[PDB]
Every structure is written in C-alpha cells, then in structure tokens.
C-alpha cells in the first residue's frame, strides 16, 4: 500500500563473485526507485556505454557497473535492452575485465554491417565495442566484438589497439564518417579530446587535438562528437562536441558542456570560443548518444547523479545506487540573444503515459493534483502559457507579480510540511525571467546534512516562459523549458514520499491562455 | 550588550531629493552591518566605479548609488576615501545625472598628470572620470574632470564622447598604454568587449572586438583589461581580461570570469579558448581594479552580492543594502593540472587586526573560539596544514577521514536555531578527495530558506592538498582564501541569531602532520 523504504536482505545483499551468463534479479519497489528511468537490478551504476540501436529496432544500453558494491569500482559493462527506451529488460553482464586488478571503463559500440573489422565474415549484424581498460598504471583502448547481437563479446586477439603511455586516456566514442571510422577520446587531465581515424576499428592514426575549450574543471571525460539536427528544420544540422567535466564543475563535481561547430572527418572547429552548459542543475553527467538510430534522430541518455554525493545517496537500502536520465531527443536551435542552444526533450513518453489526473484552462488559479492513487508515484505534467501579443510587444504591461509556482508536497497516506521540490518563474519584476528550481533542505534530513547536496538552482530566460514539461519519478525531477531549450535534472530524497503537486499562476495579463495537463505514468517494472 | 537588529527611523528614512555637496550621515551599528568592509551610509549600492589612488596615497572608491531607495535606480556616483582600503571616510556624491530622466552608470577614473585632456592647464593632480550615462533610449560614454582631487566633477562641454546608437553599451574602463589611452567597454547583449583608443580621452577611435569568449550569461558587463604580476616572480606579468556576466551565471545571476592573454595597445588575444570563474560562491561581482597604484600592486574590489537577491536582502531596516568585498591583492599563478589561475588575497589586513583569540598547534583537535566578546563581531583566521612528505608522495597513506571542519555557531547571549550560520568542510582523501564545501545552512536563516535564489552550498575541488586557509567573518559576510589565494569565495550570511563562536576541527590527519591555527578579532573601522 506504501512503497517499502527498506527491502529484505535477499534483495540488497550483493554476491562476493560476479555472476556470468545470468540476469541479476532486482527488487524495483523501493520508495526512491524510479519507475520510468533505468536503474540496475542491484549494485552501483555510473556512465552509460555502447548505446546503439540494432537493425530489428532494439536499443542496447550498456553502463558502468559495480556488481560487488554500492560504490564505484570493479567496473564491468552492465546491459539492458528496450524497443521504446522506457520498458527495459535486464541482460547478463556484457563485458568483463580480464582479471580482478583491471576494470572495463567507458566506451561506445557500433554496428559493422559491411565487415570493415574482418570479425563478421558470415553476419551483417556484427557489433564492435571500443572501450578503455583501466590497469593500475595505464588506460588503453581495447576492441571486443559480438556475433549474437551485443549480448556476449569476444576480446580482439591483438588488444590493446591504442595507448599513449598514460593512465589519463579514456572514453572512446567511435562513429562512421563517409569512408572511415573516427574515435573521439579524452586525454582527461590535459583537457584535450584526441581524434583518431581507422579503416577497420583496430588500426588507429592520430588526426587532430581539441584542447583547452570551455570550462576545464579537473578533467575532460566521455567526449561525444555528433551531428544534431535543427529543431525548426530537420534537413539542416551542425556537429556538436559534448564534453563531460569532473570534478570542478561550477555547481561542484560533474557537469556536461557542448561546442557547436564543423567536423570534416579529421578536425573539429568550434564556431566561437564560448562555453555552454547543457543542464542548469547538478544531476546530469556523461551523456552518450545512441549509434545507428533511424530518421536522423539525435537520441541521448545521461547518468542522473553528481560525483560529489552519488556514493552517499540513501538508496542502497533499496538495492541500487544511480539511475539514468530520461532518454532525450536532441536538436540545435538559436534562442534570443544567447544564440546556439542544445535542445533536450524526453524521447516519446507515450508508452508510459497513463490516465489523465487533471486538464485545466484557468489562469490566475492554483490547481491541486493528488497522485497518492498512482502506484508508480510518477507523473508527467505540461504547462503552456500563451501571453497576448500585446504583452510580447510591450513587456512593461506585465505585472511584477506575474509568476508560475509549482510545488511537490509530501504524501498524507505514506508518512515535515516542506515541499520536496519547487519551481518558481517570474515574467517581470526585479528578477524578470528568473526560473528557480529547489529541493528544500527542510524536506530531507540526508540532503540537509550532505555538504555538496545543493538546495537551489536557477536559469534566466530572455523570452517569456511559454511551455514547461516535467517528469517526477519518486526520487528524480526533470524539467524542460520552452520546447527543451533549457533543461534540469534534479535528484530529491524527501523523508516522506511526494503524493501531491500544486500549480499556481498569478498576475498574468488579460487574455493570457493557460493549459495544464497532468498524467500519471505506468511503472515499466 | 547586543547589536541592534533594527534602527531608529532617522537612520533608515531616505530623503526625497538627492543631497548635494554634503556627506550623508550613516548608522553603522546594525547586526548585519560589516565593520571592516565598505557599505554606504544609507541607500542601495552596487558596482564599484572610478577606483584610483591619488599621488598622496589616498584611495578613492566611487560606487553605483541610489540615494533615494533601498533598490537599484536613480544611479549616482557615491564616493568614499581611505589610505589603507579599510578605514573609509564617506564623501559627498561625486557625479550627478544631468536630469531626473538620466542615470550615471558604471565607469573608471584616471590621473591625467601630463594634461593630455587639456582640462588641467594649472594642475598635475587632474582626475578624469569616463562613465556611461543611461537614458531611456541610449547608453553613451561621457567625460567629467576634477581639479580638486576627485571630490567635485565638471562635465566635459562636448559630451557625449562615444555613442554607437545603442542602449546596451556601457562600463568604460580606461587606462594609459605607452603613448595612448585605451577604453574597454561592453557591447553588453552582443557578448563583445569593444576596445577604443584616444590621445586626449575625448576623441575615441575603434581598435578591436573581443567577442563570444567563456560563459556568455545574458550580458557582458564591467570589463577590466589589467596587467597582473606572477605570484612567485614580481618581475613577470600577463594581461588579463576580466568580464562580469549577469544574469545567466552557472550558480544563477551574476559572476566574474577572466581570460589571461596578451594586449599590444589595440587587441587582446586570450592564450587559449578556456572559461575561468574567479570566485566559487555567488556573492562576488563587478570587480574593478584601482588605477594609478604604486609598485606593481594589482588591487581590486568587488560588489559582495548577487543580482538575484541583492534588492531583497534583510538589511534595509539597518539603513543599507550591499557591501564591497575585502580589497584584494591580485597575482597570476600556475596551479597543478588546471594551469592559469587568478590569485586573490585580502589587501594588508594589519590596520584592522586586533588582539589574538587563539594560537593552537594541535592536530586531531577541535578548537572552540568564542568572540561574543569582540564588539566588531568580525574575526580573521589562518589555518596552515603541512602534511608529511610520505603523504605528499603517497596520497594512499592519507586516511579517508582526513578532514578539516570549520563551523560558525550562533550566539547564546543574543538570541532572536542551533544550526551553524556557515560551515567549511574539506576532505584530503576518501570518495570526495580534494572537495571543499562552503555552506550557509537554510535552517539558520528564515529569510535565506524562503528566498528561492539564496543557494545554501558551494564547493571547489583542489588537486593539491589544502596547505593554507585564510578567512574573514564580518557579521553578514564570510570570505575564504585557499592555498595562498589560489581559490577564493565570498558568501553573504543572514542568520536569525548573530554568530558568537567558531569551531575548527581537524581529524584523521597522517602521523607528523603540522597544524597551526591563528584567530584574531578585527577592530571596527566605523
Ligand atoms: C564590434 O562589436 C560590435 C558589437 O558586437 C559590433 O556592432 C554590432 O554589430 C552587430 C552585427 O552587425 C549588430 O547586430 C545586429 O544588429 C542589427 C540592427 O538591429 C540586427 O538587425 C541584427 O539582427 C544584429 O542583431 C549590433 O547592433 C552592433 N552592436 C552595437 C552597435 O553595440 C561591431 O560591428 C563590431 N565591429 C567589428 C569591426 O567587428
Ligand atoms: C595532442 O594532445 C596530447 C594530450 O595533450 C598531447 O600529448 C601530451 O603532450 C603534453 C605536452 O604537449 C605532455 O606533457 C603530455 O604528457 C602528453 N599527454 C598525453 C596524453 O600524451 C599531444 O602531444 C598532442 N599532439 C599534438 C600533435 O599536438
Ligand atoms: O567508471 C569509470 C568511467 O567514469 C568516468 C566518468 O563517467 O570517470 C569517473 O570515474 C573515474 C574512475 O574512477 C574517475 O577518474 C573520474 O574522476 C570519474 O569522473 C569516465 O571517465 C570513466 O570511463
Ligand atoms: O548600476 C548600473 C551598472 O550595473 C551593472 C552591473 O553592475 O548593470 C546592472 O544594472 C543594469 C541596469 O540597471 C542591468 O541592466 C544589469 O542587468 C545589471 O547587471 C553595470 O552594467 C551598470 O553600469
Ligand atoms: C590484468 O590484466 C591487465 C590487462 O589485461 C594487466 O595490465 C594486469 O597486469 C593483469 N593483472 C594481473 C595481476 O594479471
Ligand atoms: C587495418 O588496416 C590497416 C591499413 O589498411 C592495416 O595496417 C591493418 O593490418 C589492418 N588490420 C586488420 C586486422 O585487418
Ligand atoms: C579539415 O580541416 C582542417 C582545418 O580545420 C584541415 O587542416 C584538414 O586538412 C581538413 N581535413 C580534411 C579531411 O579536409
Ligand atoms: C543560428 O544563427 C547562426 C547565425 O545566423 C547560423 O549560422 C546558424 O545556422 C543558426 N543555428 C540554428 C540552429 O538556426
Ligand atoms: C503545449 O504546447 C506544445 C508546443 O510547445 C504542444 O506540443 C502541446 O500540444 C501543448 N500541450 C497541451 C496539452 O496543450
Ligand atoms: C509600453 O507601454 C508604456 C505604458 O504602459 C508606454 O509608455 C511605452 O511607450 C510602451 N512601450 C512600447 C514598447 O511601446
Ligand atoms: C489575472 O490577474 C491580473 C492581475 O491580478 C489581471 O489583470 C488579469 O485579468 C487576471 N487574469 C485572469 C484570467 O483573471
Ligand atoms: C536630459 O533630457 C533630455 C530631453 O529629452 C535628453 O535629450 C537628454 O539626453 C537627457 N540627459 C542628457 C542631457 O543627456
Ligand atoms: C590657469 O591659470 C591662468 C593664469 O595663470 C588662469 O587665467 C586660468 O583661468 C587657469 N585655467 C585656465 C588656463 O583656464
Ligand atoms: C583629440 O585628438 C583627436 C585625434 O583622434 C582630435 O580629433 C581632437 O581634435 C582632439 N581633441 C582635443 C585635442 O581637444
Ligand atoms: C596587435 O595584435 C593584433 C592581433 O594580433 C594585430 O592585428 C595588430 O597589428 C597588433 N597591433 C600592434 C600595435 O602591434
Ligand atoms: C604558466 O605556464 C605557462 C606555460 O608553461 C607559462 O608560459 C606561463 O608564464 C605560466 N604562468 C605563470 C603565472 O606562471
Ligand atoms: C601560514 O604560512 C604563512 C607562510 O608560510 C605564514 O606567513 C603565516 O603566518 C602562517 N600562518 C599560520 C597560522 O601559521
Ligand atoms: C589522527 O588520528 C588518526 C586516527 O584517526 C591517527 O592514525 C593519526 O596518527 C592522527 N594524526 C595525528 C597527526 O596525530
Ligand atoms: C524505511 O523508513 C520507513 C520510515 O520512513 C520505515 O518505516 C521502514 O522500516 C524503513 O526504516
Ligand atoms: C528496513 O527493514 C528491514 C527488514 O525488512 C531491515 O533489514 C532494514 O535494516 C531496514 O530497517
Ligand atoms: C542489504 O543492504 C542494505 C543496505 O545497503 C541493508 O539495509 C540490508 O540489511 C542488507 O544488508
Ligand atoms: C563468470 O565468468 C566471469 C569471467 O571473468 C567471472 O568474472 C565471474 O566471476 C564468473 O566466473
Ligand atoms: C530586530 O530583530 C530582533 C530579533 O531578531 C529584535 O530584538 C528587534 O525587535 C528587531 O525586530
Ligand atoms: C528598530 O526599528 C523597528 C521598526 O521595524 C522597531 O520595531 C524596533 O523597535 C527598533 O526601533
Ligand atoms: C527605515 O525604517 C523606518 C522604520 O523604523 C521607516 O520609518 C523609514 O521610512 C525607513 O523605511
């Protein structure tokens, strides 16, 4: 009737040896366990890896996995599959280290249907994984191949395929460019993305360096060089270098940044010298794009945590640490003044959208929506606000009190009065365009005490807020502003589960059209 | 026995007309009123302006001033003087708008001892102010001059001296380079610093653009192009472009950033394409460097607030909104891995350092220091930690518990609840190795808890272990300087109850670690 806050020992106890060829069973009933986001059956998960779609339309998600602990270490490649990026099936571990003093760090996977690698004489469904093997003294790039659709991998006989004699050289992202393979890889502590080329994925030639761009933090990680279509014109696209930095992000710990530019097969040249942060909150890192997608779709998934507190979050009693972000559709757009912007929207949520909890058209009202009866404890909401053309042509017409206040309130059934999360936007006044996203300290004993668990985040719009999409999923809130122009991923660990949300609008100009839609989400587990 | 939390109406009531040629009297006794930082006698202050040292060694501080309200507006240039940058004397308003429909926005001031301007036929102590005049439709650059040492200014007869037909064109920073005047000015909403040259400060010629560098935010503001000496070698220096952005900073609202590079009199070229943030907290903005300083001293001062909550902070009942940061000595250094770093240390604090409250050498101890008895409610603290060479060579020898925890605790003698007002946590190792957390707990401040932009927690991660930590607490402000000012944070605190105590705990340190803690009370400058 209420989601368990602690699980039986059977569900939380980790084995002393790594299971091979068997699906690790998971209890997904925890009060903090997300129901539409991916999380491992048990153990510790970090970066997504080897993300690709096979020819039959199955999306493969691999991930950094510690099967033995609820902290980072003993890295293997976990594996889950999905047709829709929401209904996940857990698979046996896909890539193992050679021994117990080695770890399988991040990497990518590609289809090799034309058998450029020479691994696939009798199949057009060959998968090649390119990943970092970590040793006490070295980080080297290794190749493994799968003839069975990416469930079981055989190491390349002549591994490693690439080394620079460094233990700060990792996160290979490989893709096809016209007539050759490209590898983007991080010389992490030199703030350099090295680009290599190959005809066969085993012989790598240095092409170019991308160094000392944007925020340095303490390290470049998980580079992604991808072609992203324009939001308003699918026929147009630009190249984007996405770099994860950890530690040393402005909000502390880990953050993603991106650089729009040109790629010609050997060199990436940023259009300008500007730094652009992907997410205005703290809990979005190591975004990886899916290889071999259909229809020029840019599909990404990120790790929904921060390295400053990911190994301390209070979910280990619920048999997991860390979830992935919602899968994302990516576009590029120009926003007023700022220009280049990476758009992020949730990938088609239709497969998980349950019955409507509220549809409202009232301006200057408070909508109270109870979802104690939604067993997932997960809701989607959409708020459209269309100001009259008068208020767009003369912003001085907008009242200083013109505001949107969204609050997520604790459950009356399943447990002090503090909201678990707040969203505040002002159209005008002294903080015009300021959007505040908060996880109040007062709502979480754990969050209050953790010295890196920041309570408050903000983004300032130039254009008025016209659209707001949100997904709440037990311990996670994702917000998308003005068709994904601005995006924030925020973990919440309230003492009491959320059971309710209030949506207040106030001081809106005469003739403002407000449309509020709220739907419960169906659990994927 | 306790600092007033509200003041008499005579002290808070603002006049309806701006006072001319008269010093505005101020009550500096408020529980939130800093005692070693500058704040205006009453009204609302933002960016520092016209910062310069006259030839007799008097530092002139001008500032964006609303004399009529406790919010932004009706901008004039306020004026305060000091020989040591701590003992401030309030002066009459220095620069007035021509009209009630005009505002004096930010700008700089230079000595013109060789009379290049032609304003100073009979003095070598001439001061020229170059500032933005704001009108409803235009932002233009104007000149005013002072023959009396920068107390009274006459507008240039043929103002404005620079206009581009824009209302997003402001914050002129002017300096002498070899044989000509340089102006750095912000084309704010185009994310461009325009550089102009002049022989006489009245005729300006376009030289170069510096565009789309580092974080854009929503606007480039308060550019500073300055020569900053190397920390470890005073004979070496590099040029630095300092740009303030507001809104749209990562932490929200306002932040400073800098670009080391080369300047050749017309063009600034950054050494790389990297973005570098000056302060790891939220309350440091619109840093301006002092013109005409002695030696090779890089001296800066910032506005110690954030535009997201500066007009809502609960200090108006104490007859002021906004203080300046501590004055800062600036250097450039290379830090491990990251490379280029703007060093910030407090300018000579000696003139305000009172009697010692504690000197300790104990490692693995909690030192409790009460300052209920220091009337300023202002303390300076230094913590030096020297790890053994073994731990410097093999960091695996450092325990996961190796930590430094400093807490500023509420007064029991002056109640308005047991929550610290400010915390500092550093880990040498463990899962967050090198992580320094600076916090202002929500639970300690009803106002801070409720304000949706008043962020509780800030962090910076070191590569090198923490070897030095300097801090100044001043009633409503904490400034920390890490590893000889390599890393720096300014943080406002508005606790319900004033701070009366600080705990300094060290724990899990390797065998033979040397710890030296010095804590001194500060003497009020008012
Ligand atoms: C140096 O930088 C300044 C500021 O970036 C440049 O002036 C500016 O030029 C840009 C681009 O031409 C102007 O932007 C455009 O304005 C028009 C007019 O409304 C608009 O229709 C366009 O869509 C675009 O936004 C901008 O107005 C202007 N900024 C000012 C005057 O402050 C200047 O041209 C640069 N000089 C050189 C030699 O690069
Ligand atoms: C491409 O970048 C790499 C990584 O920065 C360069 O290799 C390094 O070179 C620096 C000096 O420039 C050394 O101190 C580092 O130890 C090296 N790091 C690694 C990971 O090798 C490399 O030289 C660059 N190549 C070119 C063509 O410029
Ligand atoms: O699991 C290793 C994998 O994670 C990344 C970031 O996704 O690096 C993280 O883990 C590393 C190994 O402990 C740390 O050095 C690094 O600081 C942390 O970000 C990838 O770079 C790596 O492939
Ligand atoms: O007092 C104006 C002065 O302040 C700065 C930044 O310190 O700009 C601030 O005030 C402007 C006009 O009031 C705002 O447009 C801006 O957002 C705010 O940062 C300087 O640019 C200006 O000279
Ligand atoms: C484990 O394998 C890695 C690479 O395969 C190698 O560097 C390491 O020395 C091996 N360890 C042992 C102890 O065999
Ligand atoms: C990959 O191709 C390169 C050049 O064609 C060659 O040097 C190398 O031997 C090839 N490797 C394999 C295993 O085919
Ligand atoms: C790609 O562009 C770079 C410079 O941007 C140039 O040096 C290189 O030769 C180009 N390569 C190709 C494949 O055109
Ligand atoms: C943004 O504007 C620039 C300059 O006009 C243009 O080069 C680019 O194609 C635009 N990007 C998008 C996504 O429209
Ligand atoms: C809100 O507007 C968006 C376009 O931004 C549109 O996709 C959606 O249909 C609207 N939502 C509702 C439920 O009206
Ligand atoms: C906006 O309306 C005000 C009165 O509300 C008017 O004085 C001003 O000129 C208008 N501005 C524009 C953009 O027309
Ligand atoms: C909302 O309130 C504002 C000011 O309070 C008023 O001008 C406007 O008519 C109201 N809108 C509606 C839909 O009631
Ligand atoms: C003072 O008011 C006049 C009237 O429009 C305006 O033109 C001028 O720009 C204002 N301030 C000054 C003298 O620039
Ligand atoms: C400077 O002194 C002269 C006489 O030496 C006096 O006439 C004048 O008013 C002063 N300033 C100038 C030259 O206007
Ligand atoms: C300032 O020098 C300029 C040359 O750029 C000239 O146009 C102007 O006449 C001069 N003004 C003076 C000397 O007052
Ligand atoms: C300054 O450097 C710029 C950019 O390198 C160059 O265009 C200009 O000629 C230089 N000016 C001088 C005075 O050397
Ligand atoms: C930092 O390193 C660079 C490259 O070695 C050097 O040129 C520069 O002068 C150094 N800067 C300082 C402040 O030491
Ligand atoms: C810390 O070290 C510096 C330089 O070594 C020294 O001047 C200062 O007095 C020291 N402070 C303490 C508390 O030891
Ligand atoms: C501090 O305590 C630890 C145990 O936590 C001990 O091993 C270490 O030697 C102590 N350090 C000093 C310098 O006394
Ligand atoms: C999880 O927490 C709940 C209360 O929040 C307990 O009822 C349960 O036993 C477990 O400790
Ligand atoms: C929640 O309750 C379980 C029993 O199901 C305990 O094992 C656990 O320690 C927690 O209190
Ligand atoms: C498995 O792990 C959890 C905590 O991670 C415990 O709550 C449980 O008792 C079991 O040991
Ligand atoms: C299944 O096989 C793998 C291969 O290394 C082991 O890691 C695991 O413990 C089990 O033997
Ligand atoms: C300032 O606040 C204090 C308590 O915090 C009171 O003593 C005083 O009356 C004023 O409200
Ligand atoms: C300071 O001023 C406040 C006004 O809010 C008074 O209540 C208090 O008594 C003191 O005079
Ligand atoms: C300062 O506060 C006093 C109340 O003590 C007012 O009378 C005055 O106008 C100003 O607001």
PDB file of C-alpha atoms in Angstrom, chain B residues 84-86 327-329 345-353:
ATOM      1  CA  UNK B  84      44.640  51.707   3.740  1.00  0.00           C
ATOM      2  CA  UNK B  85      41.399  50.442   1.959  1.00  0.00           C
ATOM      3  CA  UNK B  86      39.835  49.550   5.366  1.00  0.00           C
ATOM      4  CA  UNK B 327      40.084  44.863  -1.027  1.00  0.00           C
ATOM      5  CA  UNK B 328      42.225  42.217  -2.846  1.00  0.00           C
ATOM      6  CA  UNK B 329      45.862  41.864  -3.944  1.00  0.00           C
ATOM      7  CA  UNK B 345      44.281  37.625  -1.217  1.00  0.00           C
ATOM      8  CA  UNK B 346      42.955  40.264   1.208  1.00  0.00           C
ATOM      9  CA  UNK B 347      44.939  43.556   0.876  1.00  0.00           C
ATOM     10  CA  UNK B 348      47.078  44.164   4.055  1.00  0.00           C
ATOM     11  CA  UNK B 349      44.612  43.451   6.946  1.00  0.00           C
ATOM     12  CA  UNK B 350      47.221  44.698   9.533  1.00  0.00           C
ATOM     13  CA  UNK B 351      45.364  48.053  10.146  1.00  0.00           C
ATOM     14  CA  UNK B 352      42.189  46.194  11.407  1.00  0.00           C
ATOM     15  CA  UNK B 353      43.766  43.113  13.156  1.00  0.00           C
TER      16      UNK B 353
END
